[PDB]
Design a binder for this molecule. Structure first.
Ligand SMILES: Nc1ncnc2c1ncn2[C@@H]1O[C@H](COP(=O)(O)OP(=O)(O)OP(=O)(O)O)[C@@H](O)[C@H]1O
Ligand SMILES: [Mg+2]
Length: 246
DNA sequence: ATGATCCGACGTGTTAGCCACGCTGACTAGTTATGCCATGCCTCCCTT
DNA sequence: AAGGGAGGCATGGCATAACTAGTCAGCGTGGCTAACACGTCGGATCAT
């Protein structure tokens, strides 16, 4: 009969339930527990494992290079940013408010770290997330359009609840393809937040995309509902380099 | 990589209204039938 | 039984005359379209 239970558990797509079947049976036998409560505990454990696996699969699907969180961010080394605003962001009220989040400042000041932390927080609470660099997004959209499947990739870039655009400005975008980026900003406008990190000021966006009018339209759509952080201070990579040297 | 599930879009059915196609009649033009003559092919008969 | 020869009938070509098909116009009837609602099928995504 035990083999039948194991086979049924595997067929019903409950691997972990079967794995811990003997342990839970022994626990129930040793200590008297109501059947309802025992099933509640078993289903709760299965749901916890399923949630962990789903979070890991979402992390894999969302191309996050390195996993980080707010807990690892040192506000003392970066006093230019108020921790209160970051904590307010972590509440994910902007998702309901459709507000974007723009990080600006010199390289290595934690912009990417903060963006990844916000993305991880969104993923944990069950919100679909996606991470990509601006150059990669533009190139992927261009390649999809050249294949006559731009709409599919546009859906891919629009479907995520939280889209992260990292390093917008380090590499100049091809003028013939900048519009692709605008499309995303045009379709995610008032629909889903965008977390964009850059080292260039807004006035220079025209240089990045090579079209002043398109850059102005993109900025107007992006900044309509957004929270802008102007981070300052010394580079964290250089700080670590000095600490290692010293 | 395959199967199962869920979601979204398209097709269908129904009803009503409008537009296009079919039928009919008349007139004109082009094609077919027929007669006649000539030639070729098919059939029948006879011989081996 | 097969081959060759002879005879008869059928076909083709040409010319003329008559009948039928095509075209156009008008009117009537049937089919297509549109709108809306509902159900089914296809596609995409996630889990094994
Ligand atoms: N305050 C901080 N606390 C902890 N780690 C930090 C902090 N600031 C930066 N780092 C780490 O330093 C490295 C570079 O920082 P990060 O990429 O977040 O900065 P950035 O401004 O987005 O960089 P860049 O523009 O050069 O790409 C990463 O490992 C990041 O985790
Ligand atoms: Mg960075």
């Amino acid at each position: 009969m035990k083999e039948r239970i194991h086979e049924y558990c595997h067929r019903l797509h409950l691997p972990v339930m079967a794995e811990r079947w003997s342990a839970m049976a022994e626990y129930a036998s040793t200590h008297n527990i109501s059947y309802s409560e025992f099933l509640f505990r078993l289903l709760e454990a299965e749901i916890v494992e399923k949630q962990a696996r789903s979070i890991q699969t979402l992390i894999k699907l969302s191309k996050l290079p390195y996993r980080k969180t707010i807990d690892t961010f040192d506000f003392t080394a970066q006093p230019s940013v108020d921790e209160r605003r970051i904590r307010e962001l972590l509440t994910l009220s902007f998702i309901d408010r459709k507000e974007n989040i723009l990080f600006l400042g010199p390289p290595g000041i934690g912009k990417t770290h903060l963006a990844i932390s916000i993305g991880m927080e969104a993923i944990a609470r069950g919100y679909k997330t996606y991470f990509i660099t601006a150059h990669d997004l533009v190139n992927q959209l261009r390649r999809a359009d050249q294949e006559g499947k731009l709409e599919k990739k546009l859906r891919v870039f629009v479907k995520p609840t939280v889209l992260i655009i990292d390093e917008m400005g380090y590499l100049k975008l091809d003028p013939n393809s900048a519009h692709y980026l605008f499309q995303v900003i045009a379709r995610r406008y008032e629909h889903a937040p965008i977390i964009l990190t850059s080292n260039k000021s807004f006035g220079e966006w025209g240089e990045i995309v090579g079209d002043s009018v398109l850059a102005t339209a993109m900025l107007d759509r992006l900044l309509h509902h957004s929270i802008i952080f102007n981070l300052k201070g010394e580079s964290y990579r250089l700080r670590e380099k000095r600490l290692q040297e010293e």
